[PDB]
Amino acid sequence: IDMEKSQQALVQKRHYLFDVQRNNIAMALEVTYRERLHRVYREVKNRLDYHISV
Amino acid sequence: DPVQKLFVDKIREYRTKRQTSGGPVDAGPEYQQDLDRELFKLKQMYGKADMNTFPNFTFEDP
């Protein structure tokens, strides 16, 4: 009886895995977003630094 | 302050120079050679991308 009850309780958290998956993938997309922003900023500043140094 | 002829000497050499500044007077082709070498080296340190636009990326997703 109690083993079955334990399985029933374990069912409740049966979704957490996909919650984790979603969090990870979404935040990875956010990572790509943010790094793209920082990289474009970097490139523009570098390109203008070229001419400043000139 | 003009009492020291050195100041006026430097000053009007300077002036004549600025008037000649229509071009860099007496640059000498070695000037241009130095420019060439160092400008390349600077560019390679800065890469080979055309220094005129916003090099496009078309960023790649997972």
Side-chain angles (χ1 to χ4, degrees):
Chain A
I1 291 157
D2 77 5
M3 183 278 288
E4 291 305 328
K5 298 292 106 180
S6 51
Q7 297 167 297
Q8 273 91 68
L10 290 161
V11 165
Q12 308 332 286
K13 61 95 175 177
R14 191 48 156 260
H15 67 97
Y16 268 43
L17 187 153
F18 292 141
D19 304 341
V20 181
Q21 168 79 297
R22 299 292 182 184
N23 287 289
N24 300 328
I25 302 298
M27 61 79 71
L29 301 184
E30 195 286 333
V31 172
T32 51
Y33 170 80
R34 200 149 279 177
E35 58 84 5
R36 293 157 165 195
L37 300 165
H38 295 299
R39 190 227 40 67
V40 57
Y41 163 100
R42 284 190 325 94
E43 82 159 355
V44 54
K45 270 201 84 85
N46 171 10
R47 305 254 298 179
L48 189 151
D49 291 331
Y50 179 78
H51 311 298
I52 288 171
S53 170
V54 168
Chain B
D1 293 331
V3 60
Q4 315 91 9
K5 194 260 156 179
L6 61 92
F7 281 115
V8 66
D9 180 10
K10 308 289 260 169
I11 285 157
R12 83 290 188 277
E13 302 163 271
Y14 164 82
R15 295 308 166 78
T16 57
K17 187 70 167 76
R18 198 234 57 71
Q19 289 86 78
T20 310
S21 196
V25 73
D26 298 329
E30 293 82 3
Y31 192 86
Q32 286 74 340
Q33 276 98 60
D34 291 331
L35 301 180
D36 300 332
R37 178 158 98 241
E38 56 87 20
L39 294 174
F40 322 121
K41 287 167 182 282
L42 187 148
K43 205 180 80 69
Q44 292 87 20
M45 183 278 288
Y46 270 101
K48 300 286 100 176
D50 60 350
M51 274 318 270
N52 318 304
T53 182
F54 293 67
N56 314 321
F57 284 92
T58 313
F59 311 94
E60 203 282 339
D61 300 337

Coordinates of all heavy atoms in Angstrom, one line a residue, chain B:
Chain B
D1 N 59.0 89.1 -23.4 CA 59.1 87.7 -23.8 C 59.8 87.5 -25.2 O 60.5 86.6 -25.4 CB 57.7 87.1 -23.8 CG 57.0 87.0 -22.5 OD1 57.8 86.9 -21.5 OD2 55.8 87.1 -22.4
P2 N 59.5 88.5 -26.1 CA 60.3 88.4 -27.3 C 61.8 88.8 -27.1 O 62.5 88.8 -28.1 CB 59.6 89.5 -28.2 CG 58.3 89.6 -27.6 CD 58.4 89.4 -26.2
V3 N 62.2 89.2 -25.9 CA 63.6 89.6 -25.7 C 64.6 88.5 -26.1 O 65.6 88.7 -26.7 CB 63.8 90.0 -24.2 CG1 63.5 88.9 -23.3 CG2 65.2 90.5 -24.0
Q4 N 64.2 87.2 -25.8 CA 65.0 86.1 -26.2 C 64.8 85.8 -27.7 O 63.7 85.4 -28.1 CB 64.7 84.9 -25.3 CG 64.6 85.2 -23.9 CD 63.2 85.6 -23.4 OE1 62.3 85.4 -24.2 NE2 63.1 86.0 -22.2
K5 N 65.8 86.0 -28.5 CA 65.6 85.8 -29.9 C 65.3 84.4 -30.3 O 64.8 84.1 -31.3 CB 66.9 86.3 -30.7 CG 66.7 86.4 -32.2 CD 67.3 85.2 -32.9 CE 66.6 85.0 -34.3 NZ 67.1 83.8 -35.0
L6 N 65.7 83.5 -29.3 CA 65.4 82.0 -29.6 C 63.9 81.8 -29.7 O 63.4 81.1 -30.6 CB 65.9 81.2 -28.4 CG 65.4 81.6 -27.0 CD1 64.1 80.7 -26.7 CD2 66.4 81.5 -25.9
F7 N 63.1 82.5 -28.9 CA 61.6 82.3 -28.9 C 61.1 82.7 -30.3 O 60.4 82.0 -31.0 CB 60.9 83.1 -27.8 CG 60.9 82.4 -26.5 CD1 61.6 82.9 -25.4 CD2 60.3 81.2 -26.3 CE1 61.6 82.3 -24.2 CE2 60.3 80.5 -25.1 CZ 61.0 81.1 -24.0
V8 N 61.5 83.9 -30.8 CA 61.0 84.4 -32.1 C 61.5 83.5 -33.2 O 60.8 83.2 -34.1 CB 61.4 85.9 -32.3 CG1 62.9 86.0 -32.4 CG2 60.7 86.4 -33.5
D9 N 62.8 83.0 -33.1 CA 63.3 82.2 -34.1 C 62.4 80.9 -34.3 O 62.0 80.6 -35.4 CB 64.7 81.8 -33.7 CG 65.4 80.8 -34.8 OD1 64.8 80.7 -35.8 OD2 66.4 80.3 -34.5
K10 N 62.2 80.2 -33.1 CA 61.3 79.1 -33.2 C 60.0 79.4 -33.7 O 59.4 78.7 -34.5 CB 61.3 78.4 -31.8 CG 62.6 78.1 -31.2 CD 63.3 76.9 -31.9 CE 63.2 75.6 -31.1 NZ 63.7 74.5 -31.9
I11 N 59.4 80.6 -33.2 CA 58.1 80.9 -33.5 C 57.9 81.1 -35.0 O 56.9 80.6 -35.6 CB 57.7 82.2 -32.7 CG1 57.4 81.9 -31.3 CG2 56.4 82.8 -33.4 CD1 57.6 83.1 -30.4
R12 N 58.8 81.8 -35.7 CA 58.5 82.1 -37.1 C 59.0 80.9 -38.0 O 58.4 80.8 -39.1 CB 59.1 83.4 -37.5 CG 60.6 83.6 -37.9 CD 61.5 83.4 -36.8 NE 62.9 83.7 -37.2 CZ 63.7 82.9 -37.8 NH1 63.3 81.7 -38.1 NH2 65.0 83.3 -38.1
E13 N 59.9 80.1 -37.6 CA 60.1 78.8 -38.3 C 58.8 78.1 -38.2 O 58.3 77.6 -39.2 CB 61.2 78.0 -37.6 CG 62.6 78.7 -37.6 CD 63.5 78.1 -36.7 OE1 63.5 78.5 -35.5 OE2 64.3 77.1 -37.1
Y14 N 58.2 78.0 -37.0 CA 56.9 77.3 -36.8 C 55.9 77.9 -37.8 O 55.1 77.2 -38.4 CB 56.5 77.5 -35.4 CG 55.0 77.3 -35.2 CD1 54.5 76.0 -35.1 CD2 54.1 78.3 -35.2 CE1 53.2 75.8 -34.9 CE2 52.8 78.1 -35.0 CZ 52.3 76.8 -34.9 OH 51.0 76.6 -34.7
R15 N 55.8 79.3 -37.8 CA 54.8 79.9 -38.7 C 55.0 79.5 -40.1 O 54.1 78.9 -40.7 CB 54.8 81.4 -38.5 CG 54.5 81.9 -37.1 CD 53.2 81.4 -36.6 NE 53.0 81.6 -35.1 CZ 52.7 82.8 -34.6 NH1 52.4 83.9 -35.4 NH2 52.6 82.9 -33.3
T16 N 56.1 79.8 -40.7 CA 56.4 79.5 -42.1 C 56.0 78.0 -42.3 O 55.5 77.7 -43.3 CB 57.9 79.6 -42.4 OG1 58.7 78.9 -41.4 CG2 58.3 81.1 -42.3
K17 N 56.3 77.2 -41.3 CA 55.9 75.8 -41.4 C 54.4 75.6 -41.6 O 53.9 74.9 -42.5 CB 56.4 75.0 -40.2 CG 56.2 73.5 -40.3 CD 57.1 73.0 -41.4 CE 57.2 71.5 -41.3 NZ 55.9 70.9 -42.0
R18 N 53.6 76.3 -40.7 CA 52.2 76.2 -40.8 C 51.7 76.7 -42.1 O 50.7 76.1 -42.7 CB 51.5 76.9 -39.6 CG 50.1 76.5 -39.3 CD 49.2 77.7 -39.4 NE 49.2 78.4 -40.6 CZ 48.7 78.0 -41.8 NH1 48.1 76.8 -41.8 NH2 48.8 78.7 -42.9
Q19 N 52.2 77.8 -42.6 CA 51.9 78.2 -43.9 C 52.2 77.2 -45.0 O 51.4 77.0 -45.9 CB 52.6 79.6 -44.2 CG 52.1 80.7 -43.4 CD 52.7 80.8 -42.1 OE1 53.9 81.3 -42.0 NE2 52.1 80.3 -41.0
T20 N 53.3 76.6 -44.9 CA 53.7 75.5 -45.8 C 52.8 74.3 -45.6 O 52.8 73.4 -46.5 CB 55.1 75.1 -45.6 OG1 56.0 76.3 -45.7 CG2 55.6 74.2 -46.7
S21 N 52.0 74.2 -44.5 CA 51.2 73.1 -44.2 C 50.1 72.8 -45.2 O 49.3 71.9 -45.0 CB 50.6 73.3 -42.8 OG 50.1 72.0 -42.3
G22 N 50.1 73.5 -46.3 CA 49.3 73.1 -47.5 C 49.7 71.7 -47.8 O 48.9 71.0 -48.5
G23 N 50.9 71.3 -47.5 CA 51.3 69.9 -47.5 C 52.3 69.6 -46.4 O 52.9 70.6 -45.9
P24 N 52.5 68.4 -46.1 CA 53.6 68.1 -45.1 C 55.0 68.3 -45.7 O 55.4 67.5 -46.5 CB 53.4 66.6 -44.7 CG 52.7 66.0 -45.9 CD 51.8 67.1 -46.5
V25 N 55.6 69.4 -45.4 CA 56.8 69.8 -46.1 C 57.9 68.9 -45.9 O 58.2 68.4 -44.8 CB 57.2 71.3 -45.8 CG1 57.8 71.3 -44.4 CG2 58.1 71.9 -46.8
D26 N 58.6 68.6 -47.0 CA 59.8 67.8 -46.9 C 59.5 66.4 -46.2 O 60.4 65.9 -45.4 CB 60.9 68.5 -46.1 CG 61.3 69.8 -46.8 OD1 61.2 69.9 -48.1 OD2 61.7 70.8 -46.1
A27 N 58.4 65.9 -46.5 CA 58.0 64.6 -45.9 C 59.1 63.5 -46.3 O 59.6 62.9 -45.4 CB 56.7 64.1 -46.4
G28 N 59.4 63.4 -47.5 CA 60.4 62.5 -48.0 C 59.9 61.1 -48.1 O 59.1 60.6 -47.3
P29 N 60.2 60.4 -49.2 CA 59.6 59.1 -49.5 C 59.8 58.1 -48.4 O 58.9 57.2 -48.3 CB 60.2 58.6 -50.8 CG 61.5 59.4 -50.9 CD 61.3 60.7 -50.2
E30 N 60.8 58.2 -47.6 CA 61.0 57.4 -46.4 C 59.8 57.6 -45.4 O 59.4 56.6 -44.8 CB 62.3 57.6 -45.8 CG 63.5 57.2 -46.7 CD 63.9 58.3 -47.7 OE1 63.2 59.3 -47.7 OE2 64.8 58.0 -48.5
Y31 N 59.4 58.8 -45.3 CA 58.1 59.0 -44.6 C 57.0 58.1 -45.1 O 56.4 57.4 -44.3 CB 57.8 60.5 -44.7 CG 56.7 61.0 -43.8 CD1 57.0 61.5 -42.5 CD2 55.4 61.1 -44.2 CE1 56.0 61.9 -41.7 CE2 54.4 61.5 -43.4 CZ 54.7 62.0 -42.1 OH 53.7 62.4 -41.3
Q32 N 56.8 58.1 -46.4 CA 55.7 57.3 -46.9 C 56.0 55.8 -46.7 O 55.0 55.1 -46.4 CB 55.6 57.6 -48.4 CG 54.9 58.9 -48.8 CD 55.9 60.1 -48.5 OE1 56.8 60.0 -47.8 NE2 55.6 61.2 -49.1
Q33 N 57.2 55.4 -46.8 CA 57.5 54.0 -46.6 C 57.2 53.6 -45.1 O 56.6 52.5 -44.9 CB 59.0 53.7 -46.9 CG 59.3 53.4 -48.3 CD 59.8 54.6 -49.1 OE1 60.8 55.2 -48.7 NE2 59.1 55.1 -50.1
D34 N 57.6 54.4 -44.2 CA 57.3 54.1 -42.8 C 55.7 54.1 -42.6 O 55.2 53.2 -41.9 CB 57.9 55.2 -41.9 CG 59.4 55.1 -41.8 OD1 59.9 54.0 -42.0 OD2 60.0 56.2 -41.6
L35 N 55.0 55.0 -43.2 CA 53.6 55.0 -43.1 C 53.1 53.7 -43.7 O 52.2 53.1 -43.0 CB 53.0 56.2 -44.0 CG 53.4 57.6 -43.6 CD1 52.7 58.6 -44.5 CD2 53.0 57.9 -42.2
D36 N 53.6 53.3 -44.8 CA 53.1 52.0 -45.4 C 53.2 50.9 -44.4 O 52.2 50.2 -44.1 CB 53.9 51.8 -46.7 CG 53.8 52.9 -47.7 OD1 52.7 53.6 -47.7 OD2 54.7 53.1 -48.5
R37 N 54.4 50.7 -44.0 CA 54.7 49.5 -43.1 C 53.8 49.5 -41.9 O 53.1 48.5 -41.6 CB 56.2 49.5 -42.7 CG 56.5 48.3 -41.8 CD 58.0 48.0 -41.8 NE 58.7 48.6 -40.7 CZ 59.7 49.5 -40.8 NH1 60.1 49.9 -42.0 NH2 60.3 50.0 -39.7
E38 N 53.8 50.6 -41.2 CA 53.1 50.7 -39.9 C 51.6 50.6 -40.1 O 50.8 50.0 -39.3 CB 53.5 51.9 -39.1 CG 53.3 53.2 -39.8 CD 51.9 53.8 -39.7 OE1 51.2 53.4 -38.8 OE2 51.6 54.6 -40.6
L39 N 51.1 51.2 -41.2 CA 49.6 51.1 -41.5 C 49.2 49.7 -41.8 O 48.2 49.2 -41.3 CB 49.3 52.0 -42.7 CG 49.4 53.5 -42.4 CD1 49.2 54.3 -43.7 CD2 48.5 54.0 -41.3
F40 N 50.0 48.9 -42.6 CA 49.7 47.5 -42.7 C 49.6 46.9 -41.4 O 48.5 46.5 -40.9 CB 50.6 46.7 -43.6 CG 51.1 47.5 -44.8 CD1 52.5 47.7 -45.0 CD2 50.3 47.9 -45.8 CE1 53.0 48.4 -46.1 CE2 50.7 48.6 -46.9 CZ 52.1 48.8 -47.1
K41 N 50.7 46.9 -40.7 CA 50.8 46.2 -39.4 C 49.6 46.5 -38.5 O 48.9 45.6 -37.9 CB 52.1 46.5 -38.6 CG 53.3 45.8 -39.2 CD 54.6 46.4 -38.7 CE 55.8 45.8 -39.3 NZ 56.1 44.5 -38.7
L42 N 49.2 47.8 -38.5 CA 48.0 48.2 -37.7 C 46.8 47.5 -38.2 O 46.0 47.0 -37.5 CB 47.9 49.7 -37.8 CG 46.8 50.4 -36.9 CD1 47.2 51.8 -36.5 CD2 45.5 50.5 -37.6
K43 N 46.6 47.5 -39.6 CA 45.4 46.9 -40.1 C 45.4 45.4 -39.8 O 44.3 44.9 -39.3 CB 45.4 47.1 -41.6 CG 44.0 47.1 -42.2 CD 44.0 47.3 -43.7 CE 44.4 46.0 -44.5 NZ 43.3 45.0 -44.4
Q44 N 46.5 44.7 -40.0 CA 46.4 43.2 -39.6 C 46.1 43.1 -38.2 O 45.3 42.2 -37.8 CB 47.7 42.5 -39.9 CG 48.1 42.4 -41.4 CD 48.8 43.5 -42.0 OE1 49.4 44.3 -41.3 NE2 48.7 43.7 -43.3
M45 N 46.6 43.9 -37.3 CA 46.2 43.8 -35.9 C 44.7 44.1 -35.7 O 44.1 43.5 -34.9 CB 47.0 44.8 -35.0 CG 46.7 44.7 -33.5 SD 45.2 45.6 -33.0 CE 45.8 47.3 -33.2
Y46 N 44.2 44.9 -36.6 CA 42.8 45.2 -36.6 C 42.0 44.3 -37.5 O 40.7 44.4 -37.6 CB 42.5 46.6 -37.1 CG 42.5 47.6 -35.9 CD1 43.6 48.4 -35.6 CD2 41.4 47.8 -35.1 CE1 43.6 49.3 -34.6 CE2 41.4 48.6 -34.0 CZ 42.5 49.4 -33.8 OH 42.5 50.3 -32.7
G47 N 42.6 43.3 -38.2 CA 41.9 42.4 -39.1 C 41.9 42.9 -40.5 O 42.5 43.9 -40.9
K48 N 41.2 42.1 -41.4 CA 41.1 42.4 -42.8 C 39.7 42.9 -43.2 O 39.6 43.1 -44.4 CB 41.5 41.1 -43.5 CG 42.9 40.6 -43.3 CD 43.9 41.4 -43.9 CE 44.6 42.4 -43.0 NZ 45.6 43.2 -43.6
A49 N 38.8 43.0 -42.3 CA 37.4 43.4 -42.7 C 37.5 44.8 -43.3 O 38.2 45.7 -42.9 CB 36.5 43.4 -41.5
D50 N 36.6 45.0 -44.3 CA 36.5 46.3 -45.0 C 36.1 47.4 -43.9 O 35.1 47.2 -43.2 CB 35.5 46.3 -46.1 CG 34.1 45.9 -45.6 OD1 33.9 45.5 -44.4 OD2 33.1 46.0 -46.4
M51 N 36.9 48.4 -43.8 CA 36.7 49.4 -42.7 C 35.8 50.5 -43.1 O 36.1 51.7 -43.0 CB 38.1 49.9 -42.3 CG 38.8 49.1 -41.3 SD 37.8 48.4 -39.9 CE 37.9 49.7 -38.7
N52 N 34.6 50.1 -43.7 CA 33.7 51.1 -44.2 C 32.3 50.8 -43.9 O 31.4 51.8 -43.9 CB 33.8 51.2 -45.8 CG 35.3 51.1 -46.2 OD1 36.1 52.0 -45.8 ND2 35.6 50.2 -47.1
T53 N 31.9 49.6 -43.5 CA 30.5 49.3 -43.3 C 30.3 48.6 -41.9 O 31.2 48.5 -41.1 CB 30.0 48.4 -44.4 OG1 28.6 48.1 -44.2 CG2 30.7 47.1 -44.4
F54 N 29.1 48.0 -41.8 CA 28.8 47.2 -40.6 C 28.8 45.7 -41.0 O 27.7 45.2 -41.4 CB 27.4 47.6 -40.0 CG 27.4 49.0 -39.5 CD1 27.5 50.1 -40.3 CD2 27.2 49.1 -38.1 CE1 27.5 51.3 -39.7 CE2 27.2 50.4 -37.6 CZ 27.3 51.5 -38.4
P55 N 29.9 45.1 -41.0 CA 30.0 43.7 -41.4 C 28.8 42.8 -40.9 O 28.7 42.6 -39.7 CB 31.3 43.2 -41.0 CG 31.9 44.2 -40.0 CD 31.2 45.5 -40.5
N56 N 28.0 42.3 -41.8 CA 26.8 41.6 -41.4 C 27.2 40.2 -40.8 O 28.3 39.7 -41.1 CB 25.9 41.4 -42.5 CG 25.7 42.7 -43.3 OD1 25.6 43.8 -42.7 ND2 25.6 42.6 -44.6
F57 N 26.3 39.7 -40.0 CA 26.6 38.4 -39.2 C 25.6 37.3 -39.5 O 26.1 36.2 -39.8 CB 26.6 38.7 -37.7 CG 27.9 39.4 -37.3 CD1 27.9 40.8 -37.2 CD2 29.0 38.7 -37.0 CE1 29.0 41.5 -36.9 CE2 30.1 39.4 -36.6 CZ 30.2 40.8 -36.5
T58 N 24.3 37.6 -39.5 CA 23.3 36.5 -39.7 C 23.6 35.4 -38.7 O 23.9 34.3 -39.0 CB 23.4 36.0 -41.1 OG1 23.5 37.1 -42.0 CG2 22.2 35.1 -41.4
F59 N 23.4 35.8 -37.4 CA 23.8 34.9 -36.3 C 23.1 33.6 -36.3 O 21.9 33.5 -36.8 CB 23.5 35.6 -35.0 CG 24.0 37.0 -34.9 CD1 23.1 38.1 -35.3 CD2 25.3 37.3 -34.6 CE1 23.6 39.4 -35.2 CE2 25.7 38.6 -34.5 CZ 24.9 39.7 -34.9
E60 N 23.8 32.6 -35.9 CA 23.4 31.2 -36.0 C 22.8 30.7 -34.7 O 23.4 30.9 -33.6 CB 24.5 30.3 -36.4 CG 24.1 28.9 -37.0 CD 23.6 27.9 -36.0 OE1 24.0 28.1 -34.8 OE2 22.9 27.0 -36.4
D61 N 21.5 30.1 -34.7 CA 20.8 29.6 -33.6 C 21.1 28.1 -33.4 O 21.4 27.4 -34.4 CB 19.3 29.8 -33.7 CG 19.0 31.3 -33.8 OD1 19.8 32.1 -33.4 OD2 17.9 31.6 -34.4
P62 N 21.0 27.6 -32.2 CA 21.4 26.2 -31.9 C 21.1 25.2 -33.0 O 22.0 24.9 -33.8 CB 20.5 25.8 -30.7 CG 20.3 27.2 -30.0 CD 20.6 28.3 -31.0

